């Protein structure tokens, strides 16, 4: 049993990585649902209101749905759980890297530094690209030849859920990086 040589930071990171995998599985299940985006045209042809007749079939609506999923929605907004799953696989692979490997000190600080830089890169990229998960999307695909409308407004059904999942994911990686930075401080504070 290596639990004696497993301090609190390693066990905390293990449980956090399990949480990462659970979050990624939940996000993949969210992406499993067929109904992803819902698109309606713009400028479509007490006061009584009347519904606007878009003059569109079901399959035309589905076509605009997938087209605006293609060319208007952000790639991170479409594969955020995908990146989450890949990156937690990387986390559990390189979390036991020192265990699965002055050479002892060397590979231990190598593991800590690799974990720290992965954490920092994840923080930078997530903080940069998290704002792109929006509900109201403006889509300007050129399918006027088939539908008749050149501009569309769409809604991403689970965009709020992806933003909340990204907030929880960022909190988890934040605790991860705080405990790993404490590990690095303890390692490099003394010889």
């Amino acid at each position: 049993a290596f639990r004696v040589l497993k301090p609190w930071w390693d066990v905390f990171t293990d449980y956090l990585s399990v949480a990462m995998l659970m979050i990624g599985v939940f996000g993949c299940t969210l992406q499993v649902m067929q109904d992803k985006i819902i698109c309606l045209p713009k400028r479509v042809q007490t006061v009584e209101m009347k519904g606007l007749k878009t003059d569109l079939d079901l399959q035309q609506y589905s076509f605009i749905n997938q087209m605006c999923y293609e060319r208007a929605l952000h790639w991170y907004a479409k594969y955020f759980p995908y990146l989450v799953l890949i990156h937690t696989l990387v986390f559990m692979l390189c979390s036991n890297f020192w265990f699965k490997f002055d050479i002892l000190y060397a590979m231990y600080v190598r593991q800590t530094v690799l974990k720290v830089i992965k954490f920092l890169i994840i923080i930078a990229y997530n903080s940069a690209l998290v704002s792109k998960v929006q509900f109201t999307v403006d889509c300007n695909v050129d399918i006027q030849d088939m539908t008749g409308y050149k501009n569309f407004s769409c809604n991403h059904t689970m965009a709020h859920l992806f933003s909340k999942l990204s907030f929880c994911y960022l909190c988890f990686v934040s605790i991860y990086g705080l405990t790993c930075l404490y590990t690095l401080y303890w390692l490099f504070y003394r010889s």
């Binding site: 042809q45 003059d55 569109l56 035309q60 008749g148």
Partner: peptide
Amino acid sequence: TGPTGIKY
């Protein structure tokens, strides 16, 4: 005028 759909 405003755009209109296509009837298939």
